[PDB]
Ligand binder design. Structure first.
Ligand code: FMN
Ligand code: F1T
Ligand code: ORO
Length: 371
């Protein structure tokens, strides 16, 4: 169904003549009224994966910033994804940086964005997630599907921890995991929070808040029925010293996983993006991103589970990430250039590769580039 030739003509048209953010908001509106195609495929028991008690039905999810407001959870998951990370949300809603702020280069399969955490705010998005969680009770088809929540700060917030605590206290209960966003290049100066000392306090404060949801306040209205796991999303634009210092902090603070990685500000060779501001995603991010997984997988001594992002388009791309050290993959740019067929196709390419490469299951491929 998501491989119907009609959708591919519509996307190729959208990519040529319609503004990126308009395409995205149109496709979200289509999902809001459940008019998008479904995935009928029964996923391979050999391509299943996990991060602690998080049981992924397949290794593919949707990266944060796709359904920022959690208005399209049901539809996006039904395209063939095991999970979705909603947000990044901020306590108060934001309209973001000036439009147009999303640009594409189809030849390089790359995207640049300067969104600036546009969202309805923690409270409205929590209302949107509560509605999905009530739908999930009635619909057995969504019973095993996972929902993460990416949390950040409002532009003008001096102390990030205040905003992270606010979000946990409102939406924590309905999340399977929380992703701490300290890596957006579009909120000055969010990336400073990746310094080891600041990151340690952020992790411990977030964890202390989740742990306190029990004491302060049935309680877990999520998939897992457990307190949410804590992940951290990191930027690829860091030196080796920084990556090591962060790795030590992750080991000490016992983070449940790491999202490697967010967009990059280090790409200079996209000609269409020369007059543009923000972070680059897509095919051009793949090598930078996979190298960062190897680095961190080794810096953390294989102790911290990895969530791969991005530059993932093919099964070969996904296998590369897995063998580098990732347990699950997240897609964003793939849905933009490949469209609705993304999940169904990538799941197939990977299954074929797992057989071809002589792996019994995906779990055996994790970190296999490292002896
Ligand atoms: C328009 C746009 C908005 C994004 N918004 C977010 C966000 O709110 N939070 C976040 O953690 N990442 C955000 N990202 C980053 C993606 O989640 C992903 O990490 C990145 O695009 C790299 O993966 P890709 O090459 O598969 O696109 C955004 C990316 C794009 C293109
Ligand atoms: C053509 C196009 N599509 C975009 N978004 C988008 C694509 C597919 C789906 C769907 F899989 F149908 F759910 C949802 C959203 C973006 C974005 C983001 N930026 O430029 C785009 N340009
Ligand atoms: O809102 C944004 O612009 C955004 C957030 C994020 O974490 N990454 C990105 O590239 N954009």
């Amino acid at each position: 169904n998501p491989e119907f030739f009609l959708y591919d003509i519509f996307l190729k048209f959208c990519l040529k003549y319609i503004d990126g953010e308009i395409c995205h908001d149109l496709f979200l509106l289509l999902g809001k009224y459940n008019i998008l195609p479904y995935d009928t495929s029964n996923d391979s028991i050999y391509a299943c994966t996990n991060i602690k008690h998080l049981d992924f039905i397949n290794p593919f999810g949707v990266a944060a910033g796709f359904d920022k407001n959690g208005v399209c959870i049901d539809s996006i998951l039904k395209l063939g994804f095991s999970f979705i990370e909603i947000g990044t949300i901020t306590p108060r809603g934001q309209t973001g940086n000036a439009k147009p702020r999303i640009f594409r280069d189809v030849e390089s399969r790359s995207i640049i964005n300067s969104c600036g955490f546009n969202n309805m705010g923690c409270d409205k998005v929590t209302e949107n997630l509560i509605l999905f969680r009530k739908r999930q009770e009635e619909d057995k088809l969504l019973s095993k599907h996972i929902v993460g929540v990416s949390i950040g700060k409002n532009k003008d917030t001096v102390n990030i921890v205040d905003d992270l605590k606010y979000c946990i206290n409102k939406i924590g209960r309905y999340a399977d995991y929380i992703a701490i966003n300290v890596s957006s290049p579009n909120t000055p100066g969010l990336r400073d929070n990746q310094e080891a000392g600041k990151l340690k306090n952020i992790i411990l404060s977030v964890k202390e808040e989740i742990d306190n949801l029990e004491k302060n306040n049935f309680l877990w209205f999520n998939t897992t029925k457990k307190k949410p796991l804590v992940f951290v999303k990191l930027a690829p634009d860091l030196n080796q010293e920084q990556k090591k210092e962060i790795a030590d902090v992750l080991l000490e603070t016992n983070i449940d996983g790491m999202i490697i990685s967010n967009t990059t500000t280090q790409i200079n060779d996209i000609k269409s993006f020369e007059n543009k501001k923000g972070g680059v995603s897509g095919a051009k991010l793949k090598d930078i991103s996979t190298k960062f997984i190897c680095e961190m997988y080794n810096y953390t001594n294989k102790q911290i589970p990895i969530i791969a992002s991005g530059g993932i388009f093919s099964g070969l791309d996904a296998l590369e990430k897995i063998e580098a050290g990732a347990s699950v993959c997240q897609l964003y740019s793939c849905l933009v250039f490949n469209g609705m067929k993304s999940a169904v196709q990538i799941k197939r390419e990977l299954n074929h590769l797992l057989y071809q490469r002589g792996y019994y299951n995906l779990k055996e491929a994790i970190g296999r580039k490292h002896s």
